[PDB]
Design a protein around this nucleic acid. Structure first.
Ligand code: CO
Ligand code: CO
Length: 218
DNA sequence: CGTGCG
DNA sequence: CGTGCG
């Protein structure tokens, strides 16, 4: 991947400035130094899979994500594929309401058992405003059986910690060995992932701020 | 590992 | 409180 592609990835998925994490066999662990270009290349090649601490040190985030998963209890069933489709359904319902609010967002298959819905901002926004917005919008949709949705950021203040992390796309899931790629509104894998990454549109912080004031003051 | 969520 | 999840 070009230097430009790496610079664009590091700009969209920009979280804690001086700590990241990588997936090991027993889970994720913090790497206590800034993310560098070689780390991205190790992610893109499948050698080391990255996870990003969304919460920056001033309790702001530059991106956010819904995490839509099939419950692990349902993976053993012969109708497992019904719950894959149900997870697409939940994703489509979130996507429509997000678009009603003019929150531009993007789909990614996670490499395991669900989808991320990625939301990017032009400059970082206060974590509690976007967590509040995402929870309100999520409460508006109907969940399908066997499907769980989590929101990142999982917290809105660090209180001296790191917060929770999210696996970022264009790598491999270390538990399955499967790539995690962007998909289109039909959930088909996109052929040119880098060019899709360049065309990703960031929402405006001033817009997010207004939308929070409107919903909060109801 | 850090810490949320049942 | 135990311990999955990223
Ligand atoms: Co997930
Ligand atoms: Co999840």
């Amino acid at each position: 991947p070009s230097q430009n592609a790496i610079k664009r990835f590091m700009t969209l998925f920009s979280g804690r400035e001086d700590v990241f994490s990588i997936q090991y066999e027993g889970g994720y662990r913090p790497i206590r130094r800034p993310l560098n270009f070689q780390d991205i290349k190790n992610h893109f090649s499948g050698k080391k899979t990255l996870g990003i601490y969304l919460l920056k040190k001033n309790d702001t985030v530059k991106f956010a994500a819904y995490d839509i998963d099939i419950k692990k209890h349902y993976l053993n069933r012969e109708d497992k594929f019904v719950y894959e489709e149900n997870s697409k359904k939940v994703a489509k319902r979130l996507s429509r309401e997000l678009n009603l609010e003019n929150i531009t967002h993007y789909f990614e298959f996670t490499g395991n058992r669900g989808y991320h819905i990625w939301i990017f901002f032009d400059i970082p926004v206060s974590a509690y405003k976007i967590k509040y917005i995402m929870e309100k919008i999520l409460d508006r949709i109907e969940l399908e059986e066997g499907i769980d949705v989590e929101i990142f950021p999982k917290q809105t203040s660090l209180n001296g910690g790191l917060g929770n992390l999210i696996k970022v796309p264009l790598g491999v899931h270390k538990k399955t060995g499967k790539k995690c790629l962007f998909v289109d509104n039909d959930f088909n894998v996109i052929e040119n992932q880098i060019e899709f990454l360049n065309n990703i549109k960031e929402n405006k912080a001033t817009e997010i701020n207004k939308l929070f004031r409107e919903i909060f003051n109801e």
